[PDB]
Structures are given as C-alpha cells and as structure tokens.
C-alpha cells in the first residue's frame, strides 16, 4: 500500500546561478523594505514560513511536507496556527511573477534559507527539485505544534518529523528571530533584543534571565523576564527537561556548534518527504549579498 | 556633545549597583564576568587583553567614544547581537549621562 514517493525534478534547464539569482531577489527586497513590523523586517516570518510548510510532514505515510508547495491552497493558507504568514506570502508573490518557472515550495523553502543567511546566520545547503502538486493533496489543519504544552509533547511531536533531542534544540533557536504577535497566536513579545540577526541569543536568554509566569491580553499563560522578553511553554520546556537542558547549555557557550547543528537540522526539515534521484545536483550553497559585492 | 554630561557621584552608585558585579574599572584590574574597563574609551570593542570575548563583541569593532557607548547601554543585545552581556539596559538618559560621565573619569 506504501505512502507517496515524491521524486524530485529540477526545473527545465536550470542550475546554480538561476537559483542564486532568486536568492538575491528575495535578499534585495529583504533589505529594502525593512520597515515591516516596526523595523524587524520580513526576515523572521520567511523562516517561519519555510517551517510551517515543512512541518506538515508525517513520516508514517509521507503526507505533507515542503514539496507540493501546498500553502497556496486556501485550506493550508487559512490554518489558525498559520496566522500572520500571509504577509510572508504577500512578500514572495512579486518575486514569483519574476520567476514563474520555480515551484511554490522550492521558493517558500528558499525564502527561509535566504532569510537566515542574510540575517548573518549559518550558510544552509539547499536543494531544488520540488514540484507543484494539485489541490487534493493539501494537508488538513492542526498538524503544526501547540505552544501551550511541555517537554513530553515537544519530544513526541518532533518524533513525527524525525527529529531528535539534539535536532529540536537546534531548530528552536530560530526563536532568537522576530516576535510573538497576540493578534496571530495569542502570545506577545520577543525572545530577545536582536530580532533580525541570527545568533545564539535564544539560549543565553533562556538561562541567564529571571523568568516569571504570567497571563496576557488573550488570557494564555507565558514566561516573562524583567528585561521585557518572553518564552512560550514549549520554549521554557527546553530547560525543565534535563536532557534538553544540557544541549541548551552547550549552544550557549559555543555559537559555532549551534550554527552547524541548525543548518543540518533546518535543511533536513525542508528536505523531509523528498526523495532525491542520484543524478540530482549536489546541494547548492549560496553566497550572501555581503560576499556578492553589496 | 549629543549626550550632554551629568553628576559623576550619582554615576558612581549607578555603577556600583548595576555594573560592579561584572566589571572593575582600576588600572590592571581583574576581569571577572566581564572585562576590566580601563581605557575603554578610545579603544576598539573586544580588545582588552586576556579576556575571552564572544565573536560578536570582536567583529563589531567600534571605537568606544561616549556616543556609541550610550547607544550600547540602553539595550546591549540590540547593539551587539549575540553578546553575552546579560543586561536589560539603562532606559533613562540621565542615568546614561550620569554613568558615562563617571565611566569616562574612572576609565582614564
Ligand atoms: C554581568 C552580568 C554584567 C554586567 C552587570 C554588566 N556587564 Fe558589561 N559586559 C559583560 C560581559 C560578559 C561583557 C562581554 C560581552 C561579550 O559579548 O563578549 C561585557 C562587556 C561590556 C563592555 C564592552 C567591552 C569591550 O568592548 O571591550 C562594556 C563597555 C560594558 N560591558 C559596560 C557595562 C556597563 C557600564 C555596565 C553597567 C551599567 C555593564 N556593562 C554591566 C557583563 C556584564
Ligand atoms: C515546538 C515548536 C514550536 C512552536 C510551538 C512555535 C510557535 C510559534 C509561535 C506561537 C510563533 C508566533 C507567531 C506570531 O506571529 O505570533 C512562532 C514564530 C516564529 N517561529 Zn516558532 N515555533 C516552534 C518552532 C519553530 C521552529 C522549529 C522554527 C524554525 C526553524 C521556528 C521559527 C519561528 C520564527 C522565526 C518565528 C518569528 C516570526 C516573526 O516574528 O515574524 N519556530 N512560532
């Protein structure tokens, strides 16, 4: 009976520099329209988009994932937990009418890779080959995780995406970016002070601050600090759980180890469900705007 | 200048209560959590000897003059992303002016 094998097909007659030029377009628009959400920019919400299209994967029967580019269809688009991402799509739309050949998923995922790299983060290897799949293979709402839970949930949830202790602690550090909007998910505030620069801030804040529990304007509970920051119950669960605590402590002292673990773990997430032929190109590592002259 | 100048006696108790716990100002003074702030002004970021800075503090390389110094103290992690200086920051301009006045005289 077996699940669906999604075989990766490179877009007709394209290679490295075609995709590098798609990077530079999202990167140029990232820096020029950096007024957004009170000067944070579009960077954080694009990585959140590359995660919400990828985190709909279930390993048992390989359904969902980044491949099909199924965020474009109403059902996935209007998912309650997928709130605010619309602006992330709105951003990528004028660049999708500049390159109509690239797949929706291939572009969505590329958006996150280019967002993190431009935000001075690790260079993440990226692969092409995602193909647009029809409306009936659109995943149904609720697949994404729930913020108000603990250590056991995050562990068992992430088992579905084939992520381990080391990998989920590496993927959560993307929370050093942007903020939680109350209009979108019922939680308010940033996880740190540097919202648009990818650092190991998330962990340093997790262990060096004094955290207290409180209720917000949409009556959900959250952990808050005196310095004005916040952590979700799923974020504070990383230091309650003794197995997760060691990995948080490790990434706190050495940023380079975190940077290497995140790229491995982020790429894997965006490559989940995809089965690459061995006549497929070796992963592309793109050059940032700073290295490419700008 | 842009930042004016305050009371250095009020800057002494702002340092003693909000900065001493990690920094020492004296010549040849010991680094504890944070570096020894002697001759910090006029000196580039991340250059006091025998201290292990986070790569963020060294690749920022700004010359500490009392202006960028006030932009730092108001929110350290926004100014130098990834800095391990575990502080919220001084949000009032007189507290900043009172403290940097003291720091510029104590760090000479
Ligand atoms: C400990 C909990 C700290 C307190 C209190 C304050 N600072 Fe700090 N400071 C600390 C560290 C760990 C570091 C190094 C950060 C890194 O990323 O490597 C610093 C650094 C500074 C610097 C820069 C030094 C340089 O560029 O050579 C300055 C100017 C500085 N700190 C000032 C400062 C002031 C005046 C404070 C009190 C209000 C203050 N810091 C407190 C740790 C801690
Ligand atoms: C457990 C698990 C988890 C959870 C629960 C979560 C959750 C969440 C939430 C709630 C939010 C908010 C929204 C709004 O707007 O308000 C977010 C955001 C978010 N997110 Zn995260 N996450 C997670 C994971 C994650 C990961 C894994 C990643 C990647 C990689 C991320 C990234 C993110 C980002 C970056 C953001 C930000 C955005 C902005 O700010 O714009 N994330 N997120």
Short mmCIF file of C-alpha atoms and ligand atoms in Angstrom, two decimals:
data_model
loop_
_atom_site.label_atom_id
_atom_site.label_comp_id
_atom_site.label_asym_id
_atom_site.label_seq_id
_atom_site.Cartn_x
_atom_site.Cartn_y
_atom_site.Cartn_z
CA UNK A 1 0.00 0.00 0.00
CA UNK A 2 3.08 2.29 0.73
CA UNK A 3 2.95 6.19 1.01
CA UNK A 4 3.73 8.67 -1.75
CA UNK A 5 7.17 8.76 -3.26
CA UNK A 6 7.74 12.39 -4.26
CA UNK A 7 10.52 12.22 -6.81
CA UNK A 8 12.47 15.47 -7.19
CA UNK A 9 12.58 17.07 -10.66
CA UNK A 10 14.83 20.05 -11.41
CA UNK A 11 13.01 22.84 -13.21
CA UNK A 12 13.56 22.52 -17.01
CA UNK A 13 17.10 23.59 -17.99
CA UNK A 14 18.08 25.35 -14.73
CA UNK A 15 21.11 25.16 -12.39
CA UNK A 16 23.03 27.05 -9.62
CA UNK A 17 23.17 30.67 -10.85
CA UNK A 18 19.44 30.63 -11.80
CA UNK A 19 18.65 29.81 -8.19
CA UNK A 20 21.37 32.19 -6.86
CA UNK A 21 19.56 34.99 -8.69
CA UNK A 22 16.28 34.02 -6.98
CA UNK A 23 18.19 34.28 -3.66
CA UNK A 24 19.50 37.80 -4.50
CA UNK A 25 15.99 38.94 -5.39
CA UNK A 26 14.48 37.88 -2.04
CA UNK A 27 17.60 39.24 -0.34
CA UNK A 28 17.41 42.65 -2.12
CA UNK A 29 13.74 43.01 -1.17
CA UNK A 30 14.59 41.86 2.35
CA UNK A 31 16.93 44.75 2.90
CA UNK A 32 14.99 47.42 1.01
CA UNK A 33 11.54 47.01 2.62
CA UNK A 34 12.90 46.68 6.18
CA UNK A 35 10.26 48.95 7.70
CA UNK A 36 7.99 45.99 8.42
CA UNK A 37 6.58 45.00 11.83
CA UNK A 38 8.35 48.04 13.45
CA UNK A 39 11.76 47.73 11.71
CA UNK A 40 12.35 43.93 12.32
CA UNK A 41 11.89 43.29 8.62
CA UNK A 42 10.47 40.38 6.66
CA UNK A 43 13.33 38.05 7.55
CA UNK A 44 11.87 36.16 10.58
CA UNK A 45 8.44 35.48 9.09
CA UNK A 46 10.01 33.92 5.99
CA UNK A 47 11.85 31.32 8.08
CA UNK A 48 8.60 30.76 9.96
CA UNK A 49 7.01 30.17 6.55
CA UNK A 50 9.75 27.71 5.48
CA UNK A 51 8.99 25.83 8.69
CA UNK A 52 5.19 25.88 8.60
CA UNK A 53 5.13 24.41 5.05
CA UNK A 54 7.70 21.79 6.04
CA UNK A 55 6.32 20.89 9.47
CA UNK A 56 3.13 19.47 7.99
CA UNK A 57 5.01 16.28 7.24
CA UNK A 58 4.19 12.97 8.91
CA UNK A 59 6.76 10.24 8.47
CA UNK A 60 4.41 7.25 8.68
CA UNK A 61 2.59 7.86 5.44
CA UNK A 62 4.84 10.63 3.98
CA UNK A 63 1.94 13.19 3.57
CA UNK A 64 2.51 16.92 3.61
CA UNK A 65 5.93 18.50 3.52
CA UNK A 66 7.56 21.27 1.53
CA UNK A 67 7.39 19.51 -1.89
CA UNK A 68 3.95 20.18 -3.25
CA UNK A 69 4.03 23.86 -2.36
CA UNK A 70 0.57 23.33 -0.90
CA UNK A 71 0.46 26.59 1.14
CA UNK A 72 -1.03 28.40 -1.88
CA UNK A 73 -4.38 26.49 -1.49
CA UNK A 74 -6.97 28.09 0.92
CA UNK A 75 -7.10 25.18 3.40
CA UNK A 76 -3.43 25.32 4.40
CA UNK A 77 -3.29 29.12 3.98
CA UNK A 78 -6.14 29.73 6.39
CA UNK A 79 -4.95 27.34 9.08
CA UNK A 80 -5.46 29.03 12.52
CA UNK A 81 -1.86 28.29 13.63
CA UNK A 82 -0.73 29.58 10.20
CA UNK A 83 -1.77 33.16 11.09
CA UNK A 84 0.36 36.12 10.01
CA UNK A 85 2.24 34.13 7.38
CA UNK A 86 0.04 35.74 4.72
CA UNK A 87 2.37 38.73 4.74
CA UNK A 88 5.23 36.32 4.19
CA UNK A 89 3.41 35.05 1.09
CA UNK A 90 2.47 38.60 0.02
CA UNK A 91 6.27 39.29 0.08
CA UNK A 92 7.16 36.33 -2.05
CA UNK A 93 4.39 36.97 -4.61
CA UNK A 94 6.08 39.74 -6.74
CA UNK A 95 9.20 37.59 -6.87
CA UNK A 96 7.09 34.63 -8.08
CA UNK A 97 5.90 36.68 -11.09
CA UNK A 98 9.56 37.48 -11.76
CA UNK A 99 10.45 33.77 -11.80
CA UNK A 100 7.25 31.80 -12.78
CA UNK A 101 9.27 28.61 -13.51
CA UNK A 102 10.33 27.91 -9.89
CA UNK A 103 7.94 25.78 -7.78
CA UNK A 104 5.96 27.30 -4.91
CA UNK A 105 7.58 25.01 -2.31
CA UNK A 106 11.05 25.40 -3.80
CA UNK A 107 10.59 29.20 -3.39
CA UNK A 108 8.96 29.08 0.07
CA UNK A 109 11.84 26.95 1.43
CA UNK A 110 14.41 29.10 -0.38
CA UNK A 111 12.84 32.09 1.38
CA UNK A 112 13.83 30.75 4.78
CA UNK A 113 17.36 29.76 3.73
CA UNK A 114 17.94 33.22 2.27
CA UNK A 115 16.32 34.88 5.28
CA UNK A 116 18.63 33.17 7.79
CA UNK A 117 21.80 33.70 5.70
CA UNK A 118 21.09 37.40 5.15
CA UNK A 119 20.45 37.70 8.87
CA UNK A 120 24.14 36.77 9.41
CA UNK A 121 23.28 33.18 10.28
CA UNK A 122 24.86 29.91 9.15
CA UNK A 123 25.05 29.11 5.50
CA UNK A 124 22.46 26.44 4.85
CA UNK A 125 22.87 23.97 1.94
CA UNK A 126 19.81 23.97 -0.31
CA UNK A 127 18.39 21.60 -2.88
CA UNK A 128 15.97 22.08 -5.76
CA UNK A 129 13.54 19.65 -7.32
CA UNK A 130 10.26 20.33 -5.55
CA UNK A 131 7.24 20.07 -7.88
CA UNK A 132 3.80 21.71 -7.53
CA UNK A 133 1.10 19.13 -6.63
CA UNK A 134 -2.75 19.62 -7.04
CA UNK A 135 -5.39 20.85 -4.53
CA UNK A 136 -6.42 17.43 -3.14
CA UNK A 137 -3.06 16.71 -1.58
CA UNK A 138 -3.40 19.71 0.68
CA UNK A 139 -2.77 18.74 4.37
CA UNK A 140 -5.54 19.34 6.87
CA UNK A 141 -5.22 21.84 9.72
CA UNK A 142 -3.72 21.16 13.16
CA UNK A 143 -0.52 19.34 12.08
CA UNK A 144 1.69 22.13 13.41
CA UNK A 145 2.61 22.12 17.17
CA UNK A 146 0.76 23.71 20.09
CA UNK A 147 2.64 26.31 22.16
CA UNK A 148 0.87 25.65 25.47
CA UNK A 149 2.43 22.28 26.38
CA UNK A 150 5.55 20.67 27.90
CA UNK A 151 8.73 18.59 27.40
CA UNK A 152 6.97 15.32 26.62
CA UNK A 153 4.85 16.90 23.89
CA UNK A 154 7.74 18.58 22.03
CA UNK A 155 9.63 15.28 22.12
CA UNK A 156 6.75 13.16 20.84
CA UNK A 157 5.65 15.84 18.38
CA UNK A 158 9.07 16.11 16.84
CA UNK A 159 9.34 12.32 16.55
CA UNK A 160 6.85 12.74 13.71
CA UNK A 161 9.33 14.91 11.80
CA UNK A 162 12.20 12.52 12.58
CA UNK A 163 13.98 14.96 14.85
CA UNK A 164 15.93 14.01 17.98
CA UNK A 165 16.92 15.81 21.21
CA UNK A 166 19.89 17.48 19.59
CA UNK A 167 17.87 18.46 16.49
CA UNK A 168 14.83 20.04 18.16
CA UNK A 169 17.06 22.05 20.50
CA UNK A 170 18.87 23.29 17.41
CA UNK A 171 15.67 24.13 15.47
CA UNK A 172 14.10 26.09 18.34
CA UNK A 173 16.95 28.67 18.35
CA UNK A 174 15.37 30.30 15.33
CA UNK A 175 13.25 31.92 18.02
CA UNK A 176 16.11 34.41 18.52
CA UNK A 177 14.40 35.93 15.45
CA UNK A 178 11.27 38.06 15.43
CA UNK A 179 8.40 38.08 17.89
CA UNK A 180 5.13 36.55 19.02
CA UNK A 181 2.14 38.66 17.88
CA UNK A 182 -1.06 38.42 20.04
CA UNK A 183 -3.30 39.00 17.03
CA UNK A 184 -1.80 35.91 15.37
CA UNK A 185 -1.37 33.31 18.11
CA UNK A 186 -2.38 34.78 21.46
CA UNK A 187 1.13 35.45 22.77
CA UNK A 188 3.03 38.76 22.89
CA UNK A 189 6.67 39.85 22.80
CA UNK A 190 10.20 38.96 21.53
CA UNK A 191 12.52 36.21 22.75
CA UNK A 192 15.47 38.60 22.72
CA UNK A 193 16.76 42.08 21.84
CA UNK A 194 18.29 41.34 18.41
CA UNK A 195 15.20 40.39 16.38
CA UNK A 196 16.69 40.44 12.91
CA UNK A 197 20.16 38.98 13.49
CA UNK A 198 20.61 35.20 13.82
CA UNK A 199 22.60 34.45 16.97
CA UNK A 200 22.56 32.07 19.94
CA UNK A 201 20.54 34.71 21.84
CA UNK A 202 17.59 32.31 22.47
CA UNK A 203 19.65 30.07 24.81
CA UNK A 204 21.61 32.82 26.57
CA UNK A 205 18.28 34.39 27.39
CA UNK A 206 16.84 31.06 28.47
CA UNK A 207 19.40 30.52 31.24
CA UNK A 208 20.78 33.97 32.21
CA UNK A 209 17.45 35.79 32.81
CA UNK A 210 15.00 35.63 35.74
CA UNK A 211 11.74 34.13 34.44
CA UNK A 212 8.24 34.56 35.97
CA UNK A 213 4.89 33.13 34.81
CA UNK A 214 2.01 35.50 33.91
CA UNK A 215 -1.18 35.74 31.82
CA UNK A 216 -1.64 38.03 28.77
CA UNK A 217 -4.27 40.08 26.93
CA UNK A 218 -5.56 36.90 25.19
CA UNK A 219 -5.54 35.03 28.52
CA UNK A 220 -2.96 32.39 27.61
CA UNK A 221 -0.05 31.91 30.03
CA UNK A 222 3.61 32.76 29.21
CA UNK A 223 7.03 33.18 30.83
CA UNK A 224 8.29 36.81 31.04
CA UNK A 225 11.55 38.49 32.14
CA UNK A 226 12.34 41.91 33.65
CA UNK A 227 14.29 42.96 30.53
CA UNK A 228 10.99 42.81 28.61
CA UNK A 229 11.37 39.41 26.85
CA UNK A 230 9.23 36.20 26.74
CA UNK A 231 9.24 32.39 26.28
CA UNK A 232 6.45 30.01 25.20
CA UNK A 233 5.73 26.95 27.46
CA UNK A 234 7.24 24.89 24.65
CA UNK A 235 10.30 27.22 24.77
CA UNK A 236 10.67 27.17 28.56
CA UNK A 237 10.28 23.35 28.39
CA UNK A 238 13.84 23.25 27.00
CA UNK A 239 15.27 23.93 30.45
CA UNK A 240 12.82 21.92 32.59
CA UNK A 241 13.71 18.69 30.74
CA UNK A 242 17.22 17.59 31.95
CA UNK A 243 18.08 16.07 28.55
CA UNK A 244 17.24 19.28 26.70
CA UNK A 245 18.99 21.44 29.37
CA UNK A 246 22.42 20.07 28.55
CA UNK A 247 22.09 20.88 24.84
CA UNK A 248 20.84 24.46 25.63
CA UNK A 249 23.84 24.95 27.94
CA UNK A 250 26.17 23.70 25.17
CA UNK A 251 24.84 26.02 22.47
CA UNK A 252 25.02 28.91 24.91
CA UNK A 253 28.84 28.71 25.28
CA UNK A 254 29.68 27.80 21.70
CA UNK A 255 27.79 29.57 18.89
CA UNK A 256 29.65 27.75 16.12
CA UNK A 257 28.37 24.33 17.22
CA UNK A 258 24.80 25.67 17.22
CA UNK A 259 25.32 27.24 13.77
CA UNK A 260 26.46 23.89 12.36
CA UNK A 261 23.68 21.89 14.04
CA UNK A 262 20.96 24.35 12.90
CA UNK A 263 21.98 24.16 9.19
CA UNK A 264 21.92 20.32 9.34
CA UNK A 265 18.58 20.31 11.12
CA UNK A 266 16.95 23.12 9.09
CA UNK A 267 17.92 21.61 5.75
CA UNK A 268 16.66 18.16 6.84
CA UNK A 269 13.29 19.74 7.78
CA UNK A 270 12.91 21.39 4.39
CA UNK A 271 14.06 18.18 2.66
CA UNK A 272 11.64 15.92 4.54
CA UNK A 273 9.47 13.71 2.36
CA UNK A 274 11.66 14.43 -0.61
CA UNK A 275 13.40 11.53 -2.23
CA UNK A 276 16.24 12.75 -4.47
CA UNK A 277 17.42 10.75 -7.57
CA UNK A 278 21.22 10.26 -7.61
CA UNK A 279 21.51 12.10 -10.91
CA UNK A 280 20.31 15.16 -8.94
CA UNK A 281 22.73 18.07 -8.31
CA UNK A 282 24.88 18.25 -5.15
CA UNK A 283 23.37 20.82 -2.65
CA UNK A 284 23.76 24.49 -3.56
CA UNK A 285 25.43 26.79 -1.04
CA UNK A 286 24.58 30.35 -1.96
CA UNK A 287 26.66 33.46 -1.45
CA UNK A 288 25.18 36.27 0.63
CA UNK A 289 24.79 39.86 -0.56
CA UNK A 290 27.81 40.89 1.56
CA UNK A 291 30.06 38.44 -0.27
CA UNK A 292 28.48 39.21 -3.68
CA UNK A 293 29.52 42.83 -3.67
CA UNK A 294 26.62 44.58 -1.91
CA UNK B 1 28.06 66.81 22.66
CA UNK B 2 24.88 64.79 21.55
CA UNK B 3 24.87 63.07 25.02
CA UNK B 4 25.42 66.03 27.45
CA UNK B 5 27.16 65.42 30.90
CA UNK B 6 25.90 64.67 34.41
CA UNK B 7 26.77 64.14 38.05
CA UNK B 8 29.70 61.72 38.48
CA UNK B 9 28.81 60.97 42.13
CA UNK B 10 25.40 59.67 41.02
CA UNK B 11 27.24 57.82 38.28
CA UNK B 12 29.34 56.11 40.90
CA UNK B 13 26.35 54.46 42.65
CA UNK B 14 24.74 53.51 39.31
CA UNK B 15 27.97 51.59 38.50
CA UNK B 16 28.35 50.13 41.99
CA UNK B 17 24.74 48.85 41.96
CA UNK B 18 24.37 47.96 38.21
CA UNK B 19 27.87 47.20 36.76
CA UNK B 20 30.46 46.33 39.53
CA UNK B 21 29.12 42.82 39.77
CA UNK B 22 30.83 42.02 36.46
CA UNK B 23 33.17 44.91 35.80
CA UNK B 24 36.13 46.56 37.58
CA UNK B 25 37.47 49.96 36.42
CA UNK B 26 41.01 50.24 38.03
CA UNK B 27 44.34 50.04 36.10
CA UNK B 28 45.50 46.44 35.67
CA UNK B 29 42.26 45.45 37.42
CA UNK B 30 40.92 41.84 37.27
CA UNK B 31 38.41 40.60 34.65
CA UNK B 32 35.57 38.81 36.43
CA UNK B 33 32.33 38.03 34.41
CA UNK B 34 33.03 40.95 32.10
CA UNK B 35 36.35 42.71 31.17
CA UNK B 36 38.33 45.35 33.01
CA UNK B 37 37.06 48.68 31.68
CA UNK B 38 40.42 50.56 31.96
CA UNK B 39 40.97 52.79 28.91
CA UNK B 40 37.81 51.50 27.29
CA UNK B 41 37.15 54.88 25.70
CA UNK B 42 39.25 55.48 22.59
CA UNK B 43 39.75 51.69 22.45
CA UNK B 44 38.08 49.32 19.97
CA UNK B 45 35.42 46.78 21.07
CA UNK B 46 36.72 43.41 22.13
CA UNK B 47 40.35 44.37 22.72
CA UNK B 48 41.17 44.17 26.45
CA UNK B 49 43.92 41.54 26.90
CA UNK B 50 43.48 38.12 28.49
CA UNK B 51 39.71 38.16 28.20
CA UNK B 52 37.72 35.79 26.01
CA UNK B 53 35.06 37.72 24.18
CA UNK B 54 32.18 36.32 22.21
CA UNK B 55 32.90 36.62 18.47
CA UNK B 56 30.07 39.20 18.26
CA UNK B 57 31.87 41.72 20.51
CA UNK B 58 35.05 41.47 18.43
CA UNK B 59 33.56 41.56 14.88
CA UNK B 60 31.56 44.66 15.79
CA UNK B 61 34.80 46.63 16.27
CA UNK B 62 33.55 50.11 17.16
CA UNK B 63 35.71 52.74 18.81
CA UNK B 64 34.23 53.44 22.19
CA UNK B 65 33.51 57.17 22.29
CA UNK B 66 30.76 58.39 24.71
CA UNK B 67 28.10 58.46 21.95
CA UNK B 68 28.03 54.91 20.61
CA UNK B 69 28.61 54.00 24.26
CA UNK B 70 25.24 55.41 25.26
CA UNK B 71 23.59 53.61 22.30
CA UNK B 72 25.11 50.40 23.75
CA UNK B 73 23.99 50.79 27.37
CA UNK B 74 20.33 51.41 26.52
CA UNK B 75 19.95 47.90 25.03
CA UNK B 76 23.21 45.86 24.80
CA UNK B 77 21.90 42.88 22.84
CA UNK B 78 20.32 45.08 20.15
CA UNK B 79 23.57 46.95 19.62
CA UNK B 80 25.88 43.95 19.68
CA UNK B 81 23.78 40.90 18.67
CA UNK B 82 24.87 37.74 20.40
CA UNK B 83 26.71 39.47 23.21
CA UNK B 84 26.80 37.57 26.49
CA UNK B 85 26.46 40.79 28.48
CA UNK B 86 23.44 39.67 30.46
CA UNK B 87 21.76 43.10 30.84
CA UNK B 88 18.46 44.83 30.07
CA UNK B 89 19.96 48.26 29.88
CA UNK B 90 19.64 51.77 31.28
CA UNK B 91 16.48 53.26 29.76
CA UNK B 92 16.78 56.82 31.17
CA UNK B 93 19.08 59.40 29.57
CA UNK B 94 20.26 60.93 32.84
CA UNK B 95 21.22 57.56 34.21
CA UNK B 96 23.19 57.08 30.99
CA UNK B 97 24.73 60.59 31.22
CA UNK B 98 25.42 60.32 34.94
CA UNK B 99 27.13 56.90 34.41
CA UNK B 100 29.23 57.66 31.30
CA UNK B 101 30.47 60.86 32.99
CA UNK B 102 31.73 58.64 35.85
CA UNK B 103 32.98 55.99 33.44
CA UNK B 104 34.93 58.49 31.39
CA UNK B 105 36.65 59.84 34.50
CA UNK B 106 37.13 56.49 36.23
CA UNK B 107 38.36 54.80 32.99
CA UNK B 108 41.04 57.46 32.06
C1 LIG C 1 27.34 40.81 34.12
C2 LIG C 1 26.22 40.09 34.43
C3 LIG C 1 27.46 42.09 33.53
C4 LIG C 1 27.00 43.35 33.98
C5 LIG C 1 26.40 43.72 35.34
C6 LIG C 1 27.42 44.35 33.03
N1 LIG C 1 28.13 43.82 32.04
FE1 LIG C 1 29.17 44.87 30.64
N2 LIG C 1 29.89 43.11 29.93
C7 LIG C 1 29.67 41.87 30.43
C8 LIG C 1 30.21 40.84 29.61
C9 LIG C 1 30.08 39.33 29.88
C10 LIG C 1 30.81 41.51 28.55
C11 LIG C 1 31.47 40.88 27.32
C12 LIG C 1 30.34 40.59 26.32
C13 LIG C 1 30.76 39.79 25.11
O1 LIG C 1 29.89 39.57 24.24
O2 LIG C 1 31.93 39.35 24.99
C14 LIG C 1 30.59 42.92 28.79
C15 LIG C 1 31.09 43.96 28.06
C16 LIG C 1 30.99 45.29 28.28
C17 LIG C 1 31.63 46.29 27.53
C18 LIG C 1 32.44 46.13 26.26
C19 LIG C 1 33.90 45.83 26.49
C20 LIG C 1 34.75 45.93 25.24
O3 LIG C 1 34.21 46.23 24.14
O4 LIG C 1 35.98 45.72 25.35
C21 LIG C 1 31.29 47.45 28.14
C22 LIG C 1 31.64 48.83 27.72
C23 LIG C 1 30.45 47.16 29.24
N3 LIG C 1 30.29 45.82 29.32
C24 LIG C 1 29.83 48.08 30.07
C25 LIG C 1 28.93 47.85 31.09
C26 LIG C 1 28.37 48.85 31.99
C27 LIG C 1 28.88 50.30 32.12
C28 LIG C 1 27.53 48.20 32.84
C29 LIG C 1 26.71 48.73 33.87
C30 LIG C 1 25.56 49.52 33.85
C31 LIG C 1 27.67 46.79 32.47
N4 LIG C 1 28.49 46.63 31.40
C32 LIG C 1 27.21 45.71 33.20
C33 LIG C 1 28.90 41.61 31.51
C34 LIG C 1 28.19 42.47 32.29
C1 LIG C 2 7.68 23.34 19.49
C2 LIG C 2 7.85 24.15 18.37
C3 LIG C 2 7.45 25.48 18.08
C4 LIG C 2 6.34 26.26 18.49
C5 LIG C 2 5.20 25.91 19.46
C6 LIG C 2 6.41 27.51 17.78
C7 LIG C 2 5.48 28.51 17.86
C8 LIG C 2 5.49 29.73 17.22
C9 LIG C 2 4.58 30.77 17.55
C10 LIG C 2 3.39 30.69 18.53
C11 LIG C 2 5.03 31.85 16.87
C12 LIG C 2 4.40 33.23 16.86
C13 LIG C 2 3.52 33.61 15.68
C14 LIG C 2 3.03 35.03 15.77
O1 LIG C 2 3.14 35.77 14.77
O2 LIG C 2 2.54 35.41 16.84
C15 LIG C 2 6.22 31.46 16.16
C16 LIG C 2 7.08 32.30 15.49
C17 LIG C 2 8.28 32.01 14.87
N1 LIG C 2 8.74 30.71 14.80
ZN1 LIG C 2 8.34 29.25 16.17
N2 LIG C 2 7.51 27.58 16.99
C18 LIG C 2 8.13 26.36 17.13
C19 LIG C 2 9.22 26.02 16.39
C20 LIG C 2 9.91 26.76 15.45
C21 LIG C 2 10.95 26.24 14.64
C22 LIG C 2 11.36 24.76 14.72
C23 LIG C 2 11.35 27.30 13.82
C24 LIG C 2 12.16 27.36 12.67
C25 LIG C 2 13.27 26.68 12.32
C26 LIG C 2 10.54 28.43 14.23
C27 LIG C 2 10.65 29.73 13.79
C28 LIG C 2 9.88 30.82 14.08
C29 LIG C 2 10.18 32.19 13.74
C30 LIG C 2 11.47 32.67 13.09
C31 LIG C 2 9.17 32.99 14.24
C32 LIG C 2 9.07 34.54 14.28
C33 LIG C 2 8.16 35.16 13.22
C34 LIG C 2 8.05 36.68 13.31
O3 LIG C 2 8.26 37.26 14.39
O4 LIG C 2 7.75 37.30 12.26
N3 LIG C 2 9.65 28.07 15.17
N4 LIG C 2 6.48 30.14 16.35
#
